[PDB]
Amino acid sequence: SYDNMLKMLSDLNKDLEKLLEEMEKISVQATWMAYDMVVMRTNPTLAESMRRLEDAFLNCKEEMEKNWQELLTETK
Amino acid sequence: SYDNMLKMLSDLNKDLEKLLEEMEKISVQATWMAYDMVVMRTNPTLAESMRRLEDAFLNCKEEMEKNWQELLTETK
C-alpha cells in the first residue's frame, strides 16, 4: 500500500504543481506587462494602453474567482 | 501632467495588485486543500477525494490558461 499512497501523492503533487506554476507564469508576465508600459512612456496612446491592460487584469481576476468558486463546488 | 501620470499609475497598480492577490489566495488555499487531505488519511474515500481535487486543480489550471490567452488577445 505504501507504494500506492506514494503514487496517489505523486499525482496530486504534480497537479497542484501545474496549477501553481501556471499562476507563477501569469504573475511574472502580468507584472512585466505593467512595468514595461509605464517605462515605455513615449507610447502615444499610453492612456488607452494602460486602460486596456488594467481592465484585462480585472477581467482575468474575476474569471479566476469564478474558476475558484467552480473548484470549491466540485470538491465540497 | 505629473499628477495625472501618478493617477494612471495608481490605477494600474491597484488592478495588477488585485490580480496578484487573487492568485495568492488561490495558491495558499489550494496548497492547504492538498496537504490537509494527505494528512487526514483516515478518510475512507481518500482515493476518490484525491482524484476529485487533482482533476479540479487541472481544470482550474486549464481555465486560467484560457483566461490568459484571452488577456493576450485583448492587449495585443
Author numbering:
A (entry chain B), B (entry chain A): 10 to 85
Q: Paper's wording?
A:
The synaptonemal complex (SC)2 is a unique biological structure, formed through the supramolecular assembly of largely α-helical coiled-coil protein components, that binds together homologous chromosome pairs during the first meiotic division (1–3). In mammals, the SC is formed of at least eight protein components: SYCP1–3, SYCE1–3, TEX12, and SIX6OS1. Thus, the role of SYCE3 as a synapsis initiation factor may be achieved by mediating SC central element interactions.
The resultant structure is more complete and covers amino acids 10–85, which includes the additional loops and short N-terminal extensions. We reasoned that this may be due to the 9-amino acid N termini that are present at either end of the molecule but are absent from the crystal structure owing to lack of electron density. We modeled N termini onto the structure using MODELLER, with them adopting largely flexible conformations. This full-length model fitted closely to experimental SAXS data with a χ2 value of 1.46, indicating that scattering data are well-explained by the crystal structure with additional unstructured N termini. Thus, we conclude that solution-state SYCE3 adopts the compact dimeric fold observed in its crystal structure. The Tyr-11/Leu-15 and Trp-41/Tyr-44 interfaces from both chains are located on the same side of the SYCE3 dimer, indicating the presence of a single self-assembly surface.
